[PDB]
C-alpha cells in the first residue's frame, strides 16, 4: 500500500507527554503543528543519510548501524545500538 498522511500518527497527547518530560508546564494550542513540522524535517535529514549509506553498500535493508552513523554525522552520537 502507498502510505500517505501518516504524520498525524504523532498524536497530540504524544507531544504532550514529550513536553511534560522536558519540564514544560503549559502548552499552547499551535505547538502541535509546529512540532510535527520540526519532527518531519529532522526525520528527513536522518533518513536521507541512512538511505545513502545503505544504497552505497548495495543493500536493500536499512540496518541499525546505518542510522547510528547518520546520527553520528549530525553531531548527535547514539550510544547503545552500535552492537
Amino acid at each position: 500500500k502507498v502510505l500517505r498522511d501518516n504524520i498525524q500518527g504523532i498524536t497530540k497527547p504524544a507531544i504532550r507527554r514529550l513536553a511534560r518530560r522536558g519540564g514544560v508546564k503549559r502548552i499552547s494550542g499551535l505547538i502541535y503543528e509546529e512540532t510535527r513540522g520540526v519532527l518531519k524535517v529532522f526525520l528527513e535529514n536522518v533518513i536521507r543519510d541512512a538511505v545513502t549509506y545503505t544504497e552505497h553498500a548495495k543493500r536493500k535493508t536499512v540496518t541499525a548501524m546505518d542510522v547510528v552513523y547518520a546520527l553520528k554525522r549530525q553531531g548527535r552520537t547514539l550510544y547503545g545500538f552500535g552492537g
Binding site: 543519510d49 545513502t52 549509506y53 544504497e55 552505497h56 553498500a57 548501524m65 552513523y69 554525522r73
Partner: protein, 91 residues
C-alpha cells in the same frame, strides 16, 4: 609551497572573462578548496572503512559528495563528476 592559485584564476577567467581577484580573496579560495577537499576525502575514508573495503573508487567519492553537499548542489556536482569520469574513460 604549493597551492591552487593558478587553477582558481583559470576558472575565474572561464566564468567571468573580465574580472580580477585580489590576493586575499585568492588566499580565501585556496583555503576553501583545501577545506572541501579534506571534508570529501575524510568522508570517503570513513565510508570505504565501514564496508570493510580498502579502495577509494569513484563510487565512494560519489557517495561522500552526496552526503556533504546539500540540496541541488549535490545533484549538479554528481552530474559533473559522472560526466567527467565518462569523458576521461572513453578518451
Amino acid at each position: 609551497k604549493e597551492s591552487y592559485s593558478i587553477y582558481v584564476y583559470k576558472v575565474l577567467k572561464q566564468v567571468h572573462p573580465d574580472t580580477g581577484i585580489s590576493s586575499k580573496a585568492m588566499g580565501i579560495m585556496n583555503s576553501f578548496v583545501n577545506d572541501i577537499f579534506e571534508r570529501i576525502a575524510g568522508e570517503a575514508s570513513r565510508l570505504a572503512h565501514y564496508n570493510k573495503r580498502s579502495t577509494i573508487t569513484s563510487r565512494e567519492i560519489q557517495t561522500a559528495v552526496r552526503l556533504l553537499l546539500p540540496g541541488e548542489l549535490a545533484k549538479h556536482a554528481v552530474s559533473e563528476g559522472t560526466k567527467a569520469v565518462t569523458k576521461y574513460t572513453s578518451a
